[PDB]
Structures are given as C-alpha cells and as structure tokens.
Design a binder for this molecule. Structure first.
Ligand SMILES: O=C1NCCN1CCOc1cc(C2=NN(C3CCCCCC3)C(=O)[C@@H]3CC=CC[C@H]23)ccc1OCCO
Ligand SMILES: [Mg+2]
Ligand SMILES: [Zn+2]
Length: 329
C-alpha cells in the first residue's frame, strides 16, 4: 500500500504554464526544475491521464489511478535509462501519437486508455541489463525463461509485475471494466508489452505492414492489436523523434546504462558487444546514426506510409537529428 504523504506529494503538483500534451514537451527540464523529480514524473502521468478524460470513462477513480502510478514507480530502479522517467516519457509520447498524430481514429477509446496504462508498466523492474545478459550468465530470470520456453526474459517479467499491481483492487485501473472489456484490457496490455522485445522488431513490423496491404478493419481484432503493438514499439524507439537537445540527453542515458552492462560482462568473463564497451570508445553520434539507419528511420517511414499518415513529423525529426549527429562527427 501507499502512504498518504507519498500520494499528497504527487497530488499537489500542477502544470498550468507547461503543456504536457505537446510534441515539444521536455521531461529533462521538468525533472531538472524541481527538487522532487520522481513526484513531478508521477504527476505528469497522473495529470496527463486525468486531463484526457479516459480513466473517468472506464470507471477508474482518481485514487486508483494515483495508487497505480505510485505502485508502478516503486518497481522502477535507479538505472541511467530504464528508470521511471523512461516509462513516463513513453506514456507522454504515445499520447502525442494518439491525439496529435490522429492515431486515436484507428483505435477504440478503451484501447487508447489501455495503451497509456501499458506504457507505464512496459519496463517494470528493469535492472539496466538486456535479455541477452540473463541468458549468457544463466541468471535465475534467464533460467526461468529457458525452462518455461518464453525467450523474452524481461518482457514476461514486466507482464508478471503488471498483473501483480493490477491484482490489488486499490490499484486496479481496469477494475471498473467487465466481461469482454476487461479481458481485452489485460490481453492487449500483455500483447503490447511482449511486442517490445527488440529481438522481435522485424517480426512485429512485417506482421503489421502485411495486414495493412488491405483496407484497415477496426472490426478485426488483429488489425487493432497490431496497431497497439506498433504504437507501443514506436513510443519505445521514439527518443530519435524528439528535439536534438532532448534526443541527445536520452542518447547519453542509454550509453551509460549500456556501458555499465558491458563492465559487468567484463567482470563475469562473458562476451561483450562493441556497443556495451566503456573503456574502448565509440562516438555517441556513430551509435545514434547506426540506430536511426538500420532501425528507427525504416520503422517510422514504413508505418507512416502504410497507414499512420498523421505521424509524418516522426520521420522528419529523426532525419533532422541524423543530420545533426553527422555534423557532431
Ligand atoms: O547511441 C548509442 N550509444 C550506445 C547505443 N547507441 C545507439 C542505440 O540507441 C538507443 C537504443 C535503444 C534501445 N536499444 N535496444 C536495441 C535495439 C536494436 C538495435 C541495437 C541496440 C539495442 C533495445 O532493445 C532497447 C529496449 C527496447 C527498445 C529500444 C531500446 C533505446 C534508445 C537509444 O538511444 C536514445 C536516443 O535516441
Ligand atoms: Mg523493455
Ligand atoms: Zn522501454
């Protein structure tokens, strides 16, 4: 359970002069301009969701929504990248895809609510170590994954914790739903989180594009779910689509986390990939350009051209940042 000092420390935060729905929203400045960045991060998610009118529409009370965010926050660790700020950022970004990029037209209101909730649970208890680390080192979570036959080590873990938070009525944001609606809420959340495993990036992207070769059918379960998966994925690789100052700060965070993994691998005598090598050094610009060219740019370009036409700015900003990193070299 949550303490009343904890709830009130978040409840009292308001943003009258800072628009949390904007594509230019700067979470780094929001964090840096307070002495309580975890409270401000929780208030951004809370006010963003209450402001939309979605929780209220699905019988999710203000207290339950606030309890849920705080339970999620407790399960986020002090790591450079996969910390609470990342999921608040993903939530805020998906919101912009839905309501600034008009993707809300392609999904039901319930599915928009589920997506925003899912963003907040999608990396629960991440240790700043990737799936490969768990498998190479034969860690208890890796062993658990191998024996159960589910290769997405962290993603299954993220789902288990989401289901656990939601098992408590005081934090069940889906507690106000019933029957088909409730099943859809859990099924869609679980499928979205499982879709975030990057070892399955091209699988999800190509399953989506083939479904969109024919007319978009909202009556089709697969069409909606694949759209939900693509938006969760887009939120996850969205740091490339932000203003250069913001994009650079996420680039530095992911670099430091990756380097800490590499250092732990060196200490354990397991294989280290160049991307995770701290002592030897690669320019930040090079990492980002490679990331954009082989992953981020084709992803955004293909989904935009296939169906998500309103998300054109994501393609534009990624290119502008790619050009800026090229200048850095
Ligand atoms: O500049 C850099 N320094 C070292 C790495 N590097 C370039 C990579 O940068 C980023 C990578 C990531 C993620 N990489 N990968 C993998 C995806 C396939 C391609 C290779 C990299 C690993 C994950 O599995 C993470 C978890 C889920 C979604 C994306 C996450 C996130 C954010 C990144 O940059 C933030 C500013 O745009
Ligand atoms: Mg993840
Ligand atoms: Zn993530």
């Amino acid at each position: 359970a949550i303490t009343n000092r904890e709830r009130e420390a978040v409840l009292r935060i308001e943003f009258p002069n800072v628009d949390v729905t904007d594509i230019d929203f700067d979470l780094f400045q929001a964090r840096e301009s307070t002495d309580k960045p975890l409270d401000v991060a929780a208030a951004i998610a809370y006010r963003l969701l209450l402001g939309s009118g979605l929780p209220q529409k699905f019988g999710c009370s203000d207290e339950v929504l606030l309890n849920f965010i705080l339970q999620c926050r407790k399960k986020y660790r002090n790591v450079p990248y996969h910390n609470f700020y990342h999921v608040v950022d993903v939530c805020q970004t998906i919101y912009t895809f839905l309501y600034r990029g008009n993707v809300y037209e392609k999904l039901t209101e319930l599915e928009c609510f589920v997506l925003l909730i899912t963003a907040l649970v999608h990396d629960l208890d991440h240790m700043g170590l990737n799936n490969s680390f768990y498998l190479k080192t034969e860690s208890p979570l890796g062993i658990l994954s191998s024996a159960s036959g589910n290769k997405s080590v962290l993603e299954v873990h993220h789902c288990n914790l989401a289901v656990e938070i939601l098992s408590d009525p005081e934090s069940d944001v889906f507690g106000g739903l019933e029957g088909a609606e409730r099943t859809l809420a859990f099924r869609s959340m679980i499928d979205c989180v499982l879709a975030t495993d990057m070892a399955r990036h091209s699988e999800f992207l190509e399953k989506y594009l083939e479904l969109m070769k024919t007319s978009y059918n909202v009556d089709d379960s697969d069409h909606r779910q694949m759209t939900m998966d693509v938006l969760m994925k887009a939120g996850d690789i969205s740091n490339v689509t932000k203003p250069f100052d913001i994009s650079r700060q996420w680039a530095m965070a992911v670099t430091e986390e990756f380097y800490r993994q590499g250092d732990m691998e060196k200490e354990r005598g397991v294989e280290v990939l160049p991307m995770f090598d701290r002592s030897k050094n690669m320019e930040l610009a090079k990492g980002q350009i490679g990331f954009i060219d082989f992953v981020a740019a084709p992803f955004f370009q293909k989904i935009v051209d296939a169906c998500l036409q309103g998300m054109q700015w994501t393609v534009d900003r990624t290119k502008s940042n790619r050009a800026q990193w090229e200048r850095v070299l």
